[PDB]
Amino acid sequence: GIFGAIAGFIENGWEGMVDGWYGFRHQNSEGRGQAADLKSTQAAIDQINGKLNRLIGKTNEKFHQIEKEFSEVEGRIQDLEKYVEDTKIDLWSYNAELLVALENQHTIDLTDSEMNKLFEKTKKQLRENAEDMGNGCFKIYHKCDNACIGSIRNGTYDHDVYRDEALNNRFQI
Amino acid sequence: GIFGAIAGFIENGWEGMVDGWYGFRHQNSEGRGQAADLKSTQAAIDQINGKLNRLIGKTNEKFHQIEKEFSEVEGRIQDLEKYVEDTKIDLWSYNAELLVALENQHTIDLTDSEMNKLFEKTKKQLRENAEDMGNGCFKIYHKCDNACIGSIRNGTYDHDVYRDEALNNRFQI
Amino acid sequence: GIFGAIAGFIENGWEGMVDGWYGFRHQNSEGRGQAADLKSTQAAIDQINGKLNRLIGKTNEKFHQIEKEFSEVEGRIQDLEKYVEDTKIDLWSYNAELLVALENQHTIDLTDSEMNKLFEKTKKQLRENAEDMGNGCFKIYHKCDNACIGSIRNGTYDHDVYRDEALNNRFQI
Amino acid sequence: PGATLCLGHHAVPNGTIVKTITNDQIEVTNATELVQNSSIGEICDSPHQILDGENCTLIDALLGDPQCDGFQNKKWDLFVERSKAYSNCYPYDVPDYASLRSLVASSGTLEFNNESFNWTGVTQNGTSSACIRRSNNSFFSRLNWLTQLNFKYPALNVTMPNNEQFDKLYIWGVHHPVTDKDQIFLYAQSSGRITVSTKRSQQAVIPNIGYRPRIRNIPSRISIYWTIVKPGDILLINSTGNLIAPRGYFKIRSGKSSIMRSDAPIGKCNSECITPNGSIPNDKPFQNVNRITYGACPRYVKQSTLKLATGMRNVPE
Amino acid sequence: PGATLCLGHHAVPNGTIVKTITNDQIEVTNATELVQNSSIGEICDSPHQILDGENCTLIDALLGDPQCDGFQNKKWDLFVERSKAYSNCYPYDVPDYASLRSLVASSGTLEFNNESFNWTGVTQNGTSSACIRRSNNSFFSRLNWLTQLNFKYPALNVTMPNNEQFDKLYIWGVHHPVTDKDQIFLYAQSSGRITVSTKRSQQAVIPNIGYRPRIRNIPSRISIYWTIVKPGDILLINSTGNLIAPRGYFKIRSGKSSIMRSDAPIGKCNSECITPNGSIPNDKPFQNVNRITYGACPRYVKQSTLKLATGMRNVPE
Amino acid sequence: PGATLCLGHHAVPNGTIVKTITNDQIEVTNATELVQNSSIGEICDSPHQILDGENCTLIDALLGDPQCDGFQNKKWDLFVERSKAYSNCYPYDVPDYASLRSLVASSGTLEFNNESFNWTGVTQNGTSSACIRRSNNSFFSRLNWLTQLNFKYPALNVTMPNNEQFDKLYIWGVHHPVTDKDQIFLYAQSSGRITVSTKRSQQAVIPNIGYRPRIRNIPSRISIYWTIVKPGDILLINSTGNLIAPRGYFKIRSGKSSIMRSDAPIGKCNSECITPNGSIPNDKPFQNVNRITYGACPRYVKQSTLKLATGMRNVPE
């Protein structure tokens, strides 16, 4: 993908995350766990639903048209009727092929983008208290229990509370 | 947007910035101020003007065609004339709808991108003298008067001048 | 480009890199050198080849159609034959114009993206041992001989080996 | 010690393959089909008004072939013509048959109003063994076969004004006798002529005497013609023999009606989109069932499947 | 203490809603309209050469109906036919009227050159009270009504070579008399015949005697035909009665000319794109004014508005 | 001291300009052309079966003009008609010539089967100096010019059943004599008539006597007609004069055959896509050589070049 996270620096997906599309796994003093991120999940789903809304249940009414099958040979007029229809079908077939290719490229890129956005947001929130390990994980340089991990997930983590501890751990020998 | 800055980590726009599309607000020892960034503004405008140049004032000449309204019932030939025209109009109507949707998605994404590029450039320029607060703002860890702020905006800021001061402020207890 | 690397924060390309599309130049204790990155190069090439595969050698067979040139004036039927063909050609001409514009925008953006991905990967790998100079270069704050540079290029660089040295050099006065 | 916090995304064990700009095969977590590829094999009788032609073509229902008497004055959104349909009356052709079929199909009505034409001096209501109705010799219900009376066929010169606020469609014909002798037996003079005109149109027809292959023991033929008469105009029929006369006019409407060739049974069910194969669901934007459609229908394409991604790239463990 | 430096972007209090791939409603700072939805209600007389038909159809101007004498030999880029137009000469029809109208419209010229046809033995210049010119009985200016002379109509066998370096268009006709008696009064013999041929074509017409509804007190009719003669070819007219003869030929050109039905007044103004509603500006790529257009015009679409974003997402404080 | 590590990308001294969504000119490292703009100037004889008409139109090869005898019974994928082609037999026309040309072209075969029609009482095999074969007066090979025998032309009433499992195409005609006297010399009675019918169709033709411009010293003409007869149907020809009779039938096939007007020489070479200019390579998706094509061909567009980027933005030092 064009943002480099999904099938990129995130080595693979999580088959065991069934309650969201994006989320967090942690290891700390109390164990290891998983939680879905609902905002990123919903952002991706809303975009996809917006596409679907444009394409599903939106058909156009046509009534009396031209004939498209013929029981007898006629020449010029029938040649024209047949060519008009073949022309139409080829143009719509092209439109359908391109539409799906563009839509699908865009769906892959937008879902890649949502993963990247969540990663970037978390990175900034952690300030000088963590380092990016390169695989979508952060090493957090302070004791960070379940409530602390929860605060990061909920956007209530105060980096200033832990900064002295973290800097001492990061910049030792 | 797909870059996550506009309507993303930048909480909102600035109605009081009327002399550019992107820019800087600061607070320092001498007050608080705003200045537009002309290069980012121009980059976005040039791209949009390039689209407009492809679409405005570019019409195609047609002359004698087929009839499209009929005063009498005729059957087969008129059925074909009507179907050819309805077919054409539906294909052009589709083309117009898709064109505008693609163009508009792209305009939103390119303007999002220009905001992100300006942010990233400033981040790099500041080196170890500032930290990203997560909302499009940097905390600058040294005295940075109006001339200093100006130097950042103009790309003449020398991070080495302030580095000792900044590191002492960042990594204290 | 929409990622801001090529024709962006990378000032220009390298005419002397002829064995890959993306790569590394270094300066260290043993000299200065260049090496192509094969994975990024191949990623870009595979995407472009995928486009080409959809467009080259994929023609459609047509046989008996309608006449498209006429030696005599006839009126209504010929007017219709001519309009059907002109309509078709204009719709295909539009399709071709849009296809190439979309494909080319996408090729530029995907190649920009691959440059950005390689930069980001290297940045993360270096951890606290280097700083981003803003022009696609890193200042590495430790002795890094040809084998060390090679380890970075090959993804075998262990940042922990050099961290004490690097931190001392970065955060001195 | 500290902690580790990893960002990630879901994956599924059963992913689906889709196409993008650069890859004709890439796996995503989920997708939906955009091409409708099946019908339910019957034409739903709702919500469009369906008229099943059964053994009758539209043109036979118009003229009034005896097997088609049940169709008199009926309307439709969609007339369904069956491949088994056959004519069982006097043998006829219609120069530009396709156009008459089309204009009646689009009008959507067989509403017919009788008119009292002044046919003085001729025998009316001619019949034939080729067109049996209730076991007796008969003829097309909407047409009046005029022949000699007392060995005379005095010239016809008959007017019918249109003082309505709508257009009238008139169907009429010419009888082509097998021989010069049969010409005399029927019409008294050796050569017939027909002129049917309005203020804005004229149609002149001469019969063509000769043998055609026998159909229901008849080697002669009738050729069918039509004429539209606008409000304030007048139909004028001027003829010295061989006229198969109208009995009145059909109403001509405009609207959304059509005709379809199909052998699919009619079902008691409700579906917006009709094809000759049967009704199809119309949730999807495209379909590859049939290029012939009526109603709110997906657009016909050549592809048998087009999968729209509805999830991210699938990257299993 | 230090400093804070914030990066940001503009916003407006009055944003505009546009559509994207995923959202049918998203607010941006500015947009522009791509569909032209209005006309100025008049057809600008520049820069295309406009010919206002006034009371004349193109075909009446061709044949030379007396109200159309002012049109002789004129050219146009666009001939404008008015809904009020009416014929005021001998009643006629044109089998394939639409094609003759189209080919003359596309040719863009009424240029006519008289030729001296050798009509020996007949009366020329027949006229009628149905076609008044300067208060006198008259006829179509470009046609020559030939009738008997001294109770004889000797067969016509007349040649006109094309020794020009351009094609000639000939317009001619057949008179259909009301009765067998009027056939005799006019043409001396009971049955007329016309053959008009070239080396590359032939057209044979027989008159059809009969009553039609009266138009300007005339129950007979004329049917109009045409023939193109190429350089080095020859027109041959061979006839024993009922010929409405050509007086010469029309030049036939190729180029960008056309015809449009409209009741919009002609204005003194300059606009490239013409529709039946009036001229429209052509800055936008699309329009929903009319599917009928002439000149450099936006393309017709069904949408009444399509807004192109010309600014970023609008995110007000 | 330490080290510096720079990330970068290649560039070339000779970049190429392409178009994107926002820029009509941007330089990339490499591109490829998507519009085929040239032909090799000859039509390759492989892999489609080519039939070069040489001096013969398809219709002249059908009827059997003497210069076209070499074409008997041949098949084609593509019949190539040359601008130099000319007729050299009895002068004729074909009402709806374009349709007969089209249906034969699409059928792809001149296969002809002789049939023994019972022409009793007439002279067969009429010939003319306008149609020389081996220095002798002759006629179209597939047509049988019937004339009086012993100053009589007894009425023809002849049947030919189709008991095959395929359709038969019959070509026949009517002779239009120059004078009423030549009508008598040839056919004994003053007026001819033809009726050609099946169970499902009828065609009635009357000759039109008159002078046409001389072609190979002939001022009369033949008009050509056709009739398709389905399995289990019957052809019935009923005529009292002027019939140009069929000698048998042509097979009518369905498939991928066509006809093209071209003066390009035929070459010994192999190319899938044919245009009137010559064969074109078909690697590219689009072409601007000719809107007329046959085979697996790029699609015709108006652009003379469309460059697809195959490298990144080029940013030279």
Ligand SMILES: CC(=O)N[C@@H]1[C@@H](O)[C@H](O[C@@H]2O[C@H](CO[C@]3(C(=O)O)C[C@H](O)[C@@H](NC(C)=O)[C@H]([C@H](O)[C@H](O)CO)O3)[C@H](O)[C@H](O)[C@H]2O)[C@@H](CO)O[C@H]1O
């Ligand atoms: C006017 C008349 O009585 N003519 C007689 C011929 O009809 C008859 O030829 C035989 O006709 C047979 C079937 O005949 C009908 C029919 O179509 O059923 C009888 C109808 O009453 C008659 N209708 C009218 C209105 O006159 C009708 C009509 O004559 C023809 O259809 C017109 O072509 O014919 C059957 O076709 C036999 O094969 C045929 O020999 C001859 C010989 O008996 O006598 C005529 O007087």
Ligand SMILES: CC(=O)N[C@@H]1[C@@H](O)[C@H](O[C@@H]2O[C@H](CO[C@]3(C(=O)O)C[C@H](O)[C@@H](NC(C)=O)[C@H]([C@H](O)[C@H](O)CO)O3)[C@H](O)[C@H](O)[C@H]2O)[C@@H](CO)O[C@H]1O
């Ligand atoms: C040849 C001739 O004089 N015939 C006489 C009939 O015209 C006439 O019938 C009456 O005709 C009335 C109007 O007549 C004109 C006309 O169209 O104005 C007079 C024209 O001079 C004549 N033109 C030529 C070239 O001969 C023209 C022509 O005969 C007809 O239009 C052809 O159809 O007719 C009007 O129509 C009356 O209603 C009608 O009775 C009869 C009876 O008076 O006498 C004929 O000798």
Ligand SMILES: CC(=O)N[C@@H]1[C@@H](O)[C@H](O[C@@H]2O[C@H](CO[C@]3(C(=O)O)C[C@H](O)[C@@H](NC(C)=O)[C@H]([C@H](O)[C@H](O)CO)O3)[C@H](O)[C@H](O)[C@H]2O)[C@@H](CO)O[C@H]1O
């Ligand atoms: C039946 C017959 O013999 N008629 C004689 C006329 O043909 C002849 O008119 C002259 O005909 C000249 C060329 O004549 C042919 C031809 O087309 O080559 C001779 C053919 O044998 C004959 N074919 C048949 C089957 O009868 C054919 C035919 O009559 C015409 O083509 C039909 O229109 O004519 C040439 O055209 C001369 O210019 C012309 O005067 C006259 C006068 O000699 O005598 C007739 O007996």
Ligand SMILES: *[C@@H]1O[C@H](CO)[C@@H](O[C@@H]2O[C@H](CO)[C@@H](O[C@@H]3O[C@H](CO)[C@@H](O)[C@H](O)[C@@H]3O)[C@H](O)[C@H]2NC(C)=O)[C@H](O)[C@H]1NC(C)=O
């Ligand atoms: C002109 O040629 C046609 C075609 O061959 C001849 O038509 C045929 O006429 C015979 C005799 O009337 C018909 O036979 C009849 O069949 C019916 C029922 O099948 C039967 O009831 C009669 O007793 C009789 O057998 C035959 O069907 C018919 N053929 C076709 C194809 O229509 C016609 O007679 C010829 N005319 C002359 C004057 O010779």
Ligand SMILES: *[C@@H]1O[C@H](CO)[C@@H](O[C@@H]2O[C@H](CO)[C@@H](O[C@@H]3O[C@H](CO)[C@@H](O)[C@H](O)[C@@H]3O)[C@H](O)[C@H]2NC(C)=O)[C@H](O)[C@H]1NC(C)=O
């Ligand atoms: C249109 O209708 C009119 C009126 O009915 C027809 O005119 C009439 O035609 C008949 C039949 O040809 C004429 O009868 C003949 O009259 C002559 C007079 O010399 C007589 O010798 C014959 O024995 C025969 O009876 C009649 O005169 C005539 N009537 C009038 C009032 O004009 C006309 O034929 C019809 N036209 C068509 C195309 O059907």
Ligand SMILES: *[C@@H]1O[C@H](CO)[C@@H](O[C@@H]2O[C@H](CO)[C@@H](O[C@@H]3O[C@H](CO)[C@@H](O)[C@H](O)[C@@H]3O)[C@H](O)[C@H]2NC(C)=O)[C@H](O)[C@H]1NC(C)=O
């Ligand atoms: C055949 O039928 C037609 C149609 O009914 C008859 O035409 C009608 O003929 C009458 C008598 O000539 C026409 O009346 C005339 O009207 C004009 C002006 O309105 C007036 O100047 C005369 O004094 C006379 O009143 C009538 O207009 C006309 N109708 C139509 C519709 O054209 C025709 O006479 C019949 N022919 C025979 C031989 O019976």
Ligand SMILES: *[C@@H]1O[C@H](CO)[C@@H](O[C@@H]2O[C@H](CO)[C@@H](O[C@@H]3O[C@H](CO)[C@@H](O)[C@H](O)[C@@H]3O)[C@H](O)[C@H]2NC(C)=O)[C@H](O)[C@H]1NC(C)=O
């Ligand atoms: C084409 O033009 C030629 C030449 O004018 C026409 O041929 C001529 O036709 C007239 C009228 O039918 C003939 O007059 C008749 O001649 C016979 C001879 O037996 C006579 O008994 C009759 O009383 C009458 O006068 C004339 O013979 C004839 N002339 C020549 C030189 O052939 C021809 O009719 C025109 N064709 C058409 C379709 O108009």
Ligand SMILES: *[C@@H]1O[C@H](CO)[C@@H](O[C@@H]2O[C@H](CO)[C@@H](O[C@@H]3O[C@H](CO)[C@@H](O)[C@H](O)[C@@H]3O)[C@H](O)[C@H]2NC(C)=O)[C@H](O)[C@H]1NC(C)=O
């Ligand atoms: C009716 O008008 C036509 C057209 O003007 C006359 O046709 C012309 O007839 C003459 C005399 O037969 C033809 O001349 C001949 O030319 C050939 C070869 O060029 C030569 O072998 C003969 O000795 C003679 O000179 C002339 O070609 C022909 N013109 C056309 C255009 O076909 C026709 O004769 C007229 N009919 C009557 C009865 O007056």
Ligand SMILES: *[C@@H]1O[C@H](CO)[C@@H](O[C@@H]2O[C@H](CO)[C@@H](O[C@@H]3O[C@H](CO)[C@@H](O)[C@H](O)[C@@H]3O)[C@H](O)[C@H]2NC(C)=O)[C@H](O)[C@H]1NC(C)=O
């Ligand atoms: C279709 O073929 C049939 C049968 O050949 C044709 O019927 C026949 O037509 C001829 C020529 O008109 C008739 O000859 C005439 O008979 C009368 C009897 O009164 C006689 O007076 C004449 O001198 C002349 O010989 C013949 O009677 C008739 N035969 C039969 C068995 O009906 C018919 O003409 C052909 N139809 C067409 C359109 O060609």
Ligand SMILES: *[C@@H]1O[C@H](CO)[C@@H](O[C@@H]2O[C@H](CO)[C@@H](O)[C@H](O)[C@H]2NC(C)=O)[C@H](O)[C@H]1NC(C)=O
């Ligand atoms: C719906 O009906 C159409 C028309 O009968 C079917 O298309 C035909 O399929 C047959 C058998 O595979 C082919 O031989 C013909 O070429 C097709 N006919 C035409 C006229 O194109 C189609 O398969 C049917 N579709 C469904 C879903 O029932």
Ligand SMILES: *[C@@H]1O[C@H](CO)[C@@H](O[C@@H]2O[C@H](CO)[C@@H](O)[C@H](O)[C@H]2NC(C)=O)[C@H](O)[C@H]1NC(C)=O
């Ligand atoms: C076009 O035709 C109209 C209607 O026939 C003409 O206007 C009439 O002219 C008559 C004759 O002089 C007058 O008596 C009337 O006052 C007019 N009637 C109406 C309803 O306007 C008009 O003059 C013609 N136009 C041209 C350009 O010739």
Ligand SMILES: *[C@@H]1O[C@H](CO)[C@@H](O[C@@H]2O[C@H](CO)[C@@H](O)[C@H](O)[C@H]2NC(C)=O)[C@H](O)[C@H]1NC(C)=O
């Ligand atoms: C331009 O003219 C066209 C044609 O008259 C107008 O479209 C018609 O609008 C009426 C009234 O709303 C409808 O009843 C008809 O269905 C339309 N006619 C046709 C032939 O489509 C159109 O509204 C006009 N547009 C402008 C901007 O003036």
Ligand SMILES: *[C@@H]1O[C@H](CO)[C@@H](O[C@@H]2O[C@H](CO)[C@@H](O)[C@H](O)[C@H]2NC(C)=O)[C@H](O)[C@H]1NC(C)=O
């Ligand atoms: C096609 O027709 C041309 C032109 O009529 C033929 O070439 C002529 O043949 C004649 C008769 O033998 C020669 O006298 C001339 O030298 C040729 N004239 C020209 C202008 O080339 C040619 O032979 C015919 N081709 C075929 C394949 O039959």
Ligand SMILES: *[C@@H]1O[C@H](CO)[C@@H](O[C@@H]2O[C@H](CO)[C@@H](O)[C@H](O)[C@H]2NC(C)=O)[C@H](O)[C@H]1NC(C)=O
């Ligand atoms: C292929 O042939 C076509 C048709 O002859 C050529 O198009 C013509 O080019 C001429 C000369 O430039 C123009 O005057 C005509 O307007 C064109 N004719 C038609 C019918 O459009 C075309 O140039 C040829 N292309 C190549 C590559 O040979």
Ligand SMILES: *[C@@H]1O[C@H](CO)[C@@H](O)[C@H](O)[C@H]1NC(C)=O
């Ligand atoms: C974070 O939010 C979750 C979900 O609402 C809640 O259960 C949890 O208690 C919160 N934890 C902290 C530490 O804020």
Ligand SMILES: *[C@@H]1O[C@H](CO)[C@@H](O)[C@H](O)[C@H]1NC(C)=O
């Ligand atoms: C920065 O550039 C602005 C605009 O040209 C100028 O007015 C200002 O003096 C510059 N300031 C510094 C500190 O370079």
